[PDB]
Amino acid sequence: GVVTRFGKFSHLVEPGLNWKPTFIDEVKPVNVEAVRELAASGVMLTSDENVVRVEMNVQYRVTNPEKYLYSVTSPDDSLRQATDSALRGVIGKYTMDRILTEGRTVIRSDTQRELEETIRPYDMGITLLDVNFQAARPPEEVKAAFDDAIAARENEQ
Amino acid sequence: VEMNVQYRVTNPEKYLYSVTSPDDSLRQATDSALRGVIGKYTMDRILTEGRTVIRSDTQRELEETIRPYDMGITLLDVNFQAARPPEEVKAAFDDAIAARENEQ
Amino acid sequence: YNRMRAEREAVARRHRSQGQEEAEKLRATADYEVTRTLAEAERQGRIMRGEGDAEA
Amino acid sequence: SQAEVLLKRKFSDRLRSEIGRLDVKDIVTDSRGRLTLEVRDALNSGSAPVINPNSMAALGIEVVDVRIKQINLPTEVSEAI
């Protein structure tokens, strides 16, 4: 709980049964010990003018509500915009072929590190827990040929 | 072409008793300045290179246009917004790029 | 607008025409190599036939 | 509402000017937020202790950061790729 004076914040109450003078101060609780989720996807552009359908999942948590509540408006939404910029910027550096097989491990690391650097000035109370890359499948328009390329190997054999 | 002009005002003795409808009069003056300057530069330049030298010239030219007037309006910033080509010719502009891809 | 539109179309035609020109050239050389390789094999086969005919 | 509009107009001009002098390759490979920093630098400090009137410092605004979420492409240009 976050006990707060009419306009001003008063003090942080710990779990249990507390008392607040009715009509004078109000409490606003926040969950700070429970994993959250923020899935960010989009049709990003690679470094070789190729298109790749990448999707990512960002599991995070929050911290002391003084920062989370009074740092930026809509902290969940604002973080999502930062995540998109990081993912596109990161994807923008590597080529399509790399991102599909090799980039899987580094892309999450770079996007996670960039996302943290992007939200350092904000001072928000959001803490990044893990960035687990989900998929980097190619565009559906070219997927047909990508499947044929594998079928061609079997046809060759 | 589309442009945005951010400005402020000053001592009302000029703004109020110099010219009728100063905001509208400034808009008409802006069109004459914008039309004149654009006429000097070519299409290709204005879209990519001319953009920075234009916001400098149009801002400077617009100021010179209102110097004799003596109005109390003060120019704050001249921030160019858009230079998209005519919608009728946009079709061909994209096809030229597609041809390169088709060539490959 | 038509004047500028016509000029832009020329660039598109130039790029597309250039690609077709290059593609045709590659196909031309490809056919030559196929014929050349096939001709060499046919030449070798004729040699074998003469030896067999000579042996018989 | 008024503040967001003003920032948008200035951002457009600075961004358009930069992209005009840059190539598509130079816009997709940028990994250090150079253009965003330059645009942010320009918005924070303009041209002319003097506070440039086209700067966000002349107003009570400070652009803490500038980022591009997703650089998509036209429908026709993407279909040819």
Q: Is A26 helix (H, G, I), strand (E, B) or coil?
A: strand
Residue with tokens 């400034």: B26
CB contact under 8 A, B77 and D16: no
**Other Cβ atoms within 10 Å of A67 Cβ, number:** 16
Query: Distance, in angstroms, between D29 CA and closest chain B CA?
Result: 20
CA separation (Å) from D22 to A27, A58, B98? 53, 33, 20
User: End-to-end alpha-carbon separation of chain C, Å?
Assistant: 82
- Residue B98 Ramachandran class (φ > 0 left, ψ -120 to 50 alpha, else beta): alpha
Phi-psi region of D17 (alpha: psi -120 to 50; beta: other; left: phi over 0): alpha
Chain A residues with CB under 8 Å of D28 CB are 45-47, 49, 92
Resolution in A, one decimal? 4.4
DSSP annotation of A156 reads: H
As to burial, measured by CB atoms within 10 angstroms (0-12 exposed, 13-18 middle, 19+ buried), residue A57 is middle
**Given D31, D73, D79, which is nearest A89 (Cβ)?**
D31
- What angle, rounded to 10 degrees, do the helices at A75-93 and A103-118 form? 140
Q: What are phi and psi of D14, to 5 degrees?
A: -60, -45
- The DSSP call for residue A143 is H
Q: Do C16 and B103 touch (CB under 8 A)?
A: yes
Q: Do the chains contact at D31 and A92, CB–CB below 8 Å?
A: yes
Helix (H) or strand (E) holding B25: helix B22-40
CA distance D48 to chain A (A): 29
Chain D residues close to B58, C-beta within 8 Å: none
Residue closest to D13 by CA, chosen among D43, D49, D41: D43
Cα separation, B41 vs D18, in Å, equals 19
Q: How many CB pairs lie under 8 A apart between chains A and D?
A: 51
User: DSSP class of residue B32?
Assistant: H
- Strand B2-8 versus strand B74-82 pairing type: antiparallel
Tokens 């596109």 — which residue? A88
Chain C nearest-CA distance from B85, in A, is 10
The full DSSP string for chain D is -HHHHHHHHHHHHHHHHHHHHS-HHHHHS--S-HHHHHHHHHHHS-------TTSTTTTT--------S-----HHHHHH-
Question: Can you tell me the distance from the alpha carbon of B103 to that of C24, in angstroms, rounded to the nearest whole number?
Answer: 12
Alpha-carbon span B56 to B58, nearest angstrom: 6
Q: Shortest CB distance from C11 goes to which of B43, B85, B96? A: B96
Nearest CA in chain A to D79: A141
- The DSSP string of A58-124 is EEEE---HHHHHSSSSSHHHHHHHHHHHHHHHHHHHS-HHHHHHTHHHHHHHHHHHHHHHHTTTT--
Question: Which of B47, B49, B76 has the CB atom closest to D53's CB atom?
Answer: B76
DSSP state of B69: T
> Which residue of chain B is at minimal alpha-carbon distance from D12?
B81
Burial C6-45 (b: 16+ CB within 10 A, else e): eebbebbeebbeebeeeeeeeeeeeeeeeeeeeeeeeeee
Exposure of A119 by Cβ count < 10 A (0-12 exposed, 13-18 middle, 19+ buried)?
buried
The Cα of A144 is separated from the nearest Cα of chain D by a number of Å equal to 15
Chain B positions with Cβ closer than 8 Å to D: 4, 6, 47-49, 51-52, 55, 75-83, 94-95, 97-98, 101-102
